């Protein structure tokens, strides 16, 4: 459903999704266009900077994309879009209902293979224009000639011909006369990849059992065969700087390098990408260069470089192994928690189910960096426990950042899944901190908070006990015991004077903080799942179990609004930075905006994925949502920062 | 030469001078349009001078057995289960949850034994209670727990008979003139053995006992014996159900330790041998399926303060046989001493010499050997000392070489005061003086 407050801006934190990317070459530089769901992203291969993002989201997922000099050809559901600088220049509708799923571009021809084994040829109108635009003919690979088309390529110096790689065969079409020139002999196992060699009229085929064939497309024979047992081959690339190496890419995430001249195996990069997300999905040498760009389905794009040889006379036999060079990446699993790091809306902290805490930049995607989990030394000098085989921390339930004393000491306080202590982090250093706050009642951490002096962190355990630690020195200061069931929300005043806790027994406790008294206790009518404290207006909102949002102020301890309308469990909510609205999101696939002055629902968005996190910026710039599927962070901009919206209630 | 000709390139006719890239592949300044096969050859030579022709394409197309097998393989060692016996010098041992972590011990854990069949671990110490833990990986819980008042326990053993394998007794004893026997029934019926049937002067403390199997040798009827180490040189063997004193075996010197070996004879008949060591180093072997008479008397080569003998490689008292046909002869015999020296004898040849030489004398840990236990397969020996911290080694054998990667400097072994091997899982339990059983799993099993 279209909205009237927030309009979609971008989905940040995404680098790849395991569509095989395309490389392109403007002049002597290289760009790398990778698909992220329904948009592509162009990267500058010398530094992996994000040059361009495609202007509109395609109506379905981009499934095959190529790149000549200035133009990028992206094939999604039925049609091929021709894009320059992100902005779409042309759209080629195919005459079928079959999904286009391969394409090549050579000459005046764009050739797009669908999944019903038909091939659509498109021609330029006059050979001076920029992209193939008019329909020319249709080719068909029937079941007699070959299997399913597994690749579609044009190996060089072949005057208007096309190498079609089917699952068992290699056909060669003349795309002007519409003819089938040559059909090879069969192959005893199903071939998955193809790459044209820089040797003349040689293609390289990669099978579903472990072998690379070097087919000579003019003799009709195979030149040589390379066997990699029990490995499905997903990429093939060739080195073109006077060193005849081949790089094969294996769907258990391996990148194997071969010398073709002296028939040895140079090196293997093991676990270069995750097998569970597809292995190495596209690996290609930037040509003339000893650097190879890999990309996998785990939302990661890397570069590896070959240093020059260490022997000053031999060289060709002492090949130094490939080392790592720059890389970009994001979360490999959908994020589980979201926060904004500062009031400027520049960085945002983001934790995922793949057990990593990233810090993503809303201004420039090169500044996105993974917060490191390299632990400090123990304070006394004793040994730290844990496994020797280091793994990442359990996935993050909650976090609370308060950069009042930033750079001074620990700054982020975070709570993990089914473990009884809350770690700290430093956002300035972008690393873990020295302290892990215990709950001291053998209960898991259900909530965290920290004061805006930056001195105090608050832990709320599942046995109902708030413990207040000092963020500088890491020791227990106080411990309140009011609740008996799990404490799901803690917050404190902007003047460190009254704190407010809410547990899932449905009591909101109001404590004085300087004196350790309680000021009161208010029993609601459902267990409370989440609190958000708007700190300037002193109004906090509770997501109750009866699917209402109770807005209650902390000064006079009354329920002052009660917002009804959600049909399932409220996953998240957040206040406007001016504290006028509250945006919630719930498991009925909806996001609502409530004007708590008038107490009604301003806007509603039906979004197909359920939004698990909603956060406003600390200025009124952006909304950041986080959904069930999708490894990134969806970013919306409120149009009411530029116009004024009517606080008049919607329905249906 | 070529496997196809398409008959379209010959009648095509290209221009040349329209674009700057094709403007270079002319051979004259008057050429403007050329034939298709000529044009294909021009840009074939141009492709060949952009990317120069390598040697792997025209060099070769597809006693070399080793080179071929190396060019196909990627791993070069035995894979997972086609090993069946341990690799030396590098263990494979993960750490599980500490077994008594569920219910803490109030004393140093003095003895420790697994069940022969069930997943049960019995711990016990000087706080005069004994605890049984259902062990697994994650959650080692406490089955039951029995606190004998006024009776600190020092040795506790699961006994399970060979006839019906349905008794499941626990024999436990400390520095007392009695020994308790709990009959496992899942109230608790325990009995007390407190009568040496005329032999109370030579047995003033029931601390060092061991439980074993004995055959009648006129019927094929087995029964358990407990064996008590007494003052002078005496071992008092008595029935494990009736408590009747059966026989006694006296060695000459200060009796320090003893172990039980079994050897099969025929179908359904075996023979029990008691192996008892002087402090000085001389070893007696008593046949006790007949009257307790000496059959062999030999001497440990070296060794002057002898604390602990153990056998292994077959059925010991800590790897017990559940069925009488599964009784095996022990291969190895380790005699561990006060200096930390452990002689190791191979009884496949060292039952004949009467001054037999050890296959190796280990010297890796330097203080008094207080535990040494063989893994049930008989491929690891575990030396352990309760005198300094972290004094435990697992020596691989037959190679007689200590594993060098475990334990490390960060293994929380503690002051190792007991150790036990699982009969089936390949699993160490190590109890220290703080009251903690730590638990490890050997991934070879």
């Amino acid at each position: 459903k279209n909205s009237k407050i927030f309009s979609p801006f971008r989905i940040i934190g995404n680098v790849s999704n395991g569509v095989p990317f395309a490389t392109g070459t403007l002049g002597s530089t290289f760009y790398i266009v990778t698909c992220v769901g329904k948009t592509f992203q162009i990267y500058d291969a010398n530094t992996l900077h994000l040059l361009f993002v495609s202007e509109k989201e395609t109506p379905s997922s981009i499934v095959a994309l190529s790149a000549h000099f200035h133009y990028v050809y992206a094939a999604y559901e039925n049609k091929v879009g021709i894009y320059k600088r992100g902005i779409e220049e042309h759209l080629l509708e195919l005459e079928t209902d079959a999904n286009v799923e391969h394409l090549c571009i050579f000459g005046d021809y764009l050739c797009a293979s669908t999944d019903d084994n038909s091939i659509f040829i498109y021609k330029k109108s006059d050979p001076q224009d920029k992209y193939p635009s008019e329909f020319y003919t249709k080719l068909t690979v029937t079941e007699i000639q070959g299997g399913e088309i597994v690749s579609l390529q044009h190996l060089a110096t072949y005057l208007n011909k096309l190498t079609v790689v089917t699952k068992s065969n290699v056909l060669l079409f003349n795309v002007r006369t519409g003819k089938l020139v040559f059909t090879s002999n069969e192959f005893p196992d199903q071939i998955t990849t193809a790459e044209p060699a820089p040797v003349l009229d040689i293609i390289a085929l990669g099978t579903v059992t472990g072998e690379v064939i070097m087919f000579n497309m003019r003799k009709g024979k195979r030149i040589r065969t390379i066997k990699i047992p029990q490995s499905r081959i997903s990429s093939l690339s060739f080195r073109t700087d006077g060193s005849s190496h081949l790089s094969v890419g294996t769907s258990s995430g391996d990148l194997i390098f071969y010398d073709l001249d002296r028939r040895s195996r140079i090196h293997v990069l093991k676990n270069i990408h995750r097998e569970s997300y597809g292995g190495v999905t596209q690996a290609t040498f930037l040509n003339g260069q000893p650097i190879i760009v890999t990309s996998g389905g785990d939302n990661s794009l890397k570069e590896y470089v070959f240093d020059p040889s260490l022997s000053q006379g031999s060289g060709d036999v002492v090949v130094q192994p490939p080392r790592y060079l720059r890389s970009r990446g994001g979360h490999s699993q959908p994020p589980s928690y979201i926060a904004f790091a500062d009031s400027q809306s520049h960085f945002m902290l983001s934790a995922s189910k793949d057990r990593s805490l990233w810090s993503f930049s809303l201004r420039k995607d090169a500044q996105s960096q993974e917060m490191s989990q390299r632990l400090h030394k123990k304070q006394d000098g004793g040994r730290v426990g844990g496994s020797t085989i280091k793994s990442k921390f359990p996935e993050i339930v909650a976090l609370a950042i308060e950069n009042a004393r930033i750079g001074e000491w620990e700054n982020i306080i975070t709570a993990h899944k089914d473990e009884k202590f809350a770690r700290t982090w430093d956002m300035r250093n972008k690393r873990v901190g020295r302290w892990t706050f215990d709950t001291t009642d053998d209960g898991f951490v259900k909530s965290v908070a920290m004061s805006q002096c930056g001195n105090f962190g608050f832990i709320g355990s599942s046995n109902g006990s708030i413990t207040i630690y000092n963020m500088q020195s890491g020791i227990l200061r106080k411990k309140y015991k009011l609740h008996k069931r799990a404490v799901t929300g803690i917050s404190l005043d902007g003047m460190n004077r009254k704190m407010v806790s809410c547990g899932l027994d449905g009591i909101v406790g109001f404590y004085d903080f300087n004196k350790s008294t309680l000021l009161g206790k208010l029993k609601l009518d459902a267990p409370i799942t989440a609190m958000v404290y708007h700190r300037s207006s002193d109004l906090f909102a509770l997501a109750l179990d009866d699917l209402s949002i109770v807005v209650i102020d902390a000064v006079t301890q009354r329920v002052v609004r009660q917002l009804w309308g959600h049909s399932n469990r409220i996953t998240a909510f957040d206040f406007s930075p001016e504290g006028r609205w509250i945006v919630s999101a719930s498991l009925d696939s909806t996001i609502r905006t409530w004007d708590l002055p008038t107490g009604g629902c301003i806007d509603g968005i039906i979004v197909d994925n359920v939004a698990t996190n909603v956060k406003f910026s600390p200025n009124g710039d952006l909304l950041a949502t986080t959904h069930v599927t999708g490894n990134g962070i969806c970013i919306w901009t409120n149009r009411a920062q530029f116009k004024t919206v009517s606080t008049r209630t919607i329905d249906e | 030469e070529a496997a196809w000709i398409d008959s379209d390139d010959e009648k095509i006719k290209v221009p040349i001078l329209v674009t700057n890239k094709t403007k270079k592949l002319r051979t004259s300044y008057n050429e403007s349009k050329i034939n298709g096969v000529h044009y294909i050859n021009r840009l074939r030579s141009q492709f060949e001078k952009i990317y120069p022709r390598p040697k792997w394409v025209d060099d070769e197309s597809d006693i070399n057995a080793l080179t071929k097998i190396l060019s196909t393989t990627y791993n070069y060692k035995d894979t997972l289960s086609n090993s069946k016996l341990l690799p030396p010098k590098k263990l494979d041992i993960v750490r599980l949850k500490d077994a008594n972590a569920s219910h803490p011990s109030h004393s140093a854990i003095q003895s420790l034994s697994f069940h022969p069949s069930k997943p049960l671990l019995l711990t016990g110490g000087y706080d005069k209670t004994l605890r049984i833990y259902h062990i697994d990986g994650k959650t080692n819980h406490l089955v039951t727990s029995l606190h004998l008042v006024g009776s600190p326990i020092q040795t506790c053993t699961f006994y399970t008979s060979l006839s019906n394998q349905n008794q499941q007794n626990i024999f436990t004893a400390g520095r007392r003139r009695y020994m308790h026997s709990w009959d496992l029934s899942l109230t608790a019926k325990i009995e007390k053995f407190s009568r040496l049937y005329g032999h109370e002067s030579t047995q003033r403390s029931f601390e060092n006992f061991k439980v074993a199997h004995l055959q009648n040798s006129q019927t094929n009827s087995v029964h358990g014996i407990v064996l008590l180490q007494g003052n002078n040189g005496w071992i008092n063997i008595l029935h494990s159900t009736s408590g009747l004193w059966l026989m006694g075996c006296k060695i000459e010197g200060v009796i320090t330790d003893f172990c039980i070996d079994y050897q099969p004879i025929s179908r359904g008949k075996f023979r029990t041998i008691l192996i008892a060591v002087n402090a000085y180093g001389e070893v007696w072997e008593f046949d006790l399926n007949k009257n307790g008479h000496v059959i062999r008397r030999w001497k440990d080569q070296g060794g002057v303060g002898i604390t602990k003998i153990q056998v292994g490689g077959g059925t010991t008292t800590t790897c017990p046989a559940l069925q009488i046909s599964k009784i095996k002869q022990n291969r190895w015999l380790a005699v561990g001493s006060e200096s930390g020296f452990v002689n190791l004898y191979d009884r496949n040849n060292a039952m004949t010499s009467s001054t037999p030489t050890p296959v190796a004398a280990l010297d890796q840990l330097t203080t008094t050997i207080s535990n040494l236990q063989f893994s049930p397969d008989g491929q690891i020996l575990c030396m352990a000392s309760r005198a300094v911290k972290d004094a435990l080694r697992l020596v691989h054998l037959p190679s007689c070489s200590v594993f060098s990667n475990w334990p490390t400097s960060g293994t929380p072994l503690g002051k190792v005061t007991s150790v036990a091997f699982s009969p089936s899982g390949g699993l160490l339990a190590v109890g220290n003086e703080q009251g903690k059983v730590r638990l490890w799993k050997l991934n070879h099993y």
């Binding site: 530089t29 005046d108 005057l159 | -």
Partner: peptide, 28 residues
Amino acid sequence: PKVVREAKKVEMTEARAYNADADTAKAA
């Protein structure tokens, strides 16, 4: 002293590439 496995600073170079736009011809 062991051998020095230090990495050089890598800069890209100017490479020539065959473009396939000359691999398409029209008939009269």
